[PDB]
Design an enzyme around this catalytic site. Structure first.
Site, PDB file in Angstrom:
ATOM      1  CD  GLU A 130      -2.706   0.771   2.668  1.00  0.00           C
ATOM      2  OE1 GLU A 130      -2.516  -0.204   3.436  1.00  0.00           O
ATOM      3  OE2 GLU A 130      -3.588   1.580   2.833  1.00  0.00           O
ATOM      4  N   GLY A 169      -7.991   5.374   6.730  1.00  0.00           N
ATOM      5  CA  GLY A 169      -8.849   5.251   7.914  1.00  0.00           C
ATOM      6  C   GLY A 169      -8.241   4.393   9.042  1.00  0.00           C
ATOM      7  CB  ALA A 170      -7.783   1.096   9.571  1.00  0.00           C
ATOM      8  CB  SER A 171      -2.552   1.534   8.259  1.00  0.00           C
ATOM      9  OG  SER A 171      -2.820   1.536   6.868  1.00  0.00           O
ATOM     10  CB  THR A 172      -0.773   6.747   8.467  1.00  0.00           C
ATOM     11  OG1 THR A 172      -0.358   7.868   7.623  1.00  0.00           O
ATOM     12  CG2 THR A 172       0.285   6.587   9.636  1.00  0.00           C
ATOM     13  CD  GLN A 173      -0.331   3.017   4.591  1.00  0.00           C
ATOM     14  OE1 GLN A 173      -0.710   2.526   5.696  1.00  0.00           O
ATOM     15  NE2 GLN A 173      -1.190   3.639   3.751  1.00  0.00           N
TER      16      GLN A 173
END
Ligand code: 8E9
Ligand code: 8E9
Length: 421
Positions: A130, A169-173
């Site tokens: 992702e 909404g549920a992780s960040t990269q």
């Protein structure tokens, strides 16, 4: 001018988007040639919100699928590949119930196979996928993979690449090309694109997306204060305790079945609540971002997209505040967080269903950048907040498509007679 098409369903944590891409058959291998043709937003939640009724995940997609029937010309349908990729929402569901997760995938698979596109599978992306595919999308669309110059006079150093920061909404990269030596194989990426080696760093922080952060700040507020300093004064809600702790992201915080939680517009206490999300106390590497994760220093330009973009757009366009420097970004979050509920409502004449959360999400971005990734004044000024490049939504969808459709060659036709040697 004969065009080919490709469709990606980006099954995000709190919603699903469909993107249809197009490109001339003749020139499909040039960088930047694929562009967005149309998109469609699926009503209701993300496919993982249907764990308790998996057939609805499938069904949720029908309307956008019909639109795709219309956007792609009828005789290209059968040779237009269709992909679904799912991100941290389905990764979280995978820890809770791999069986519910498996039924959700089968249900979307069954719906998508009914369509006459070339269905190529419904998959959960790793966190590495992702981040790397978003970095690909942005650099592809902006033509950062072209070798600039001409024979006997090549640009040196090579054209810089854009780092990518994606807030879902549920992780960040965070993903960016780096010269630093790797200290952790989990974060290390090597790409061969158009004859060039790109050494790339990537990490996905599960439970650090917008919504799971809000959930954790709410549970944390409930436990430390019994009031929500990030919420505006005059705003309150009845929190059902059981739902607050049900996410994998908050169950570590579980300590009368309903409690009233009221906002206090307190920028200081909000910032303290947010800073506790970033555990900076240990680092088993030469250097870290937070929570013991290796991160070499950030360098070069970055595009910060998805919820980074929308939160900053709110600050500048609706609050009317500058955010060109970290300091200005910090000031913008203070001012936002200090608004009362009636003051805040008075600045937005529409229906903003998540208005009370802007303060927290903004404080989260400011601390993620400064305390988490260690941007400072100098590096922050190379950050651009943008949701779009070359008429295309920036996301991991395009890069994912390009990769599975094999539309970026590892080397150039004829190794370009070997003059990029
Ligand atoms: C694709 C699409 C179409 C119409 C409206 C939106 N709005 C949004 C779409 C996304 S997405 O998940 O990145 O797709 C998104 N992440 C956001 C929004 C938002 O409108 C938004 C508003 C305020 C704070 C955060 C967001 C936000 O993160 C997105
Ligand atoms: C601040 C915050 C916190 C949690 C979720 C969001 N997301 C959103 C908040 C708003 S709001 O009504 O302007 O409040 C909003 N209109 C949207 C979103 C969205 O996340 C969103 C995602 C995909 C398509 C459209 C939207 C969207 O329109 C925003």
């Amino acid at each position: 001018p004969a065009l080919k098409y490709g469709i990606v369903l980006d099954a995000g944590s709190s919603h699903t988007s469909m993107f249809v891409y197009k490109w001339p058959a003749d020139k499909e291998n040039d960088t930047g040639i694929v562009g967005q043709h149309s998109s469609c937003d699926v009503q209701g939640g993300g496919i993982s919100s249907y764990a308790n009724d998996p057939s609805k995940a499938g069904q949720s997609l029908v309307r956008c699928l019909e639109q795709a029937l219309r956007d792609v010309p009828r005789d290209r349908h059968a040779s237009t590949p269709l992909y679904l990729g799912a991100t941290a929402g389905m990764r979280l569901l995978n820890l809770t119930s791999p069986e519910a997760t498996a039924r959700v995938l089968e249900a979307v698979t069954q719906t998508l196979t009914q369509y006459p596109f070339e269905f190529r599978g419904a998959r959960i992306l790793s966190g590495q996928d992702e981040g790397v595919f978003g970095w690909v999308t942005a650099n592809y669309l902006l033509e950062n993979f072209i070798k600039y110059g001409w024979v006997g006079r090549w640009i040196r150093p090579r054209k810089g690449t854009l780092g990518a920061m994606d807030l879902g909404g549920a992780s960040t990269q965070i993903t960016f090309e780096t010269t630093s030596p790797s200290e952790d194989p989990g974060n290390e990426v090597h790409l061969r694109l158009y004859g060039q080696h790109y050494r790339v760093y990537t990490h996905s922080f599960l439970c650090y997306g917008r919504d799971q952060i809000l959930l954790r700040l709410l549970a944390s507020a409930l436990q430390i204060h019994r009031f929500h300093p990030c919420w505006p004064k005059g705003y309150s809600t009845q929190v059902l305790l059981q739902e607050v702790y049900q996410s994998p992201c908050t169950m570590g915080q579980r300590p009368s079945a309903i409690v009233s939680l009221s906002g206090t517009s307190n920028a200081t206490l909000c910032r303290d609540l947010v800073s506790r999300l970033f555990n900076i106390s240990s680092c088993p590497f030469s250097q870290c971002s937070f929570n013991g994760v290796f991160q070499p220093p950030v360098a070069g330009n970055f595009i910060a997209f998805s919820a980074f973009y929308y939160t900053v757009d709110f600050l500048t366009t609706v609050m009317g505040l500058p955010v060109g420097t970290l300091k200005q970004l910090e000031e913008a979050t203070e001012i936002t967080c200090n608004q009362t509920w009636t003051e805040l409502q008075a600045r937005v004449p529409g229906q903003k269903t998540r208005l009370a959360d802007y303060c927290a999400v903004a404080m989260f971005i400011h601390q993620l950048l400064s305390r988490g990734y260690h941007f400072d004044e100098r590096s922050f000024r190379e950050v651009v907040f943008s949701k779009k490049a070359a008429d295309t939504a920036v996301g991991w969808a395009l890069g994912y498509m390009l990769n599975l459709t094999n539309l970026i060659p590892a080397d150039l036709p004829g190794l370009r007679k070997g003059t990029h040697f």
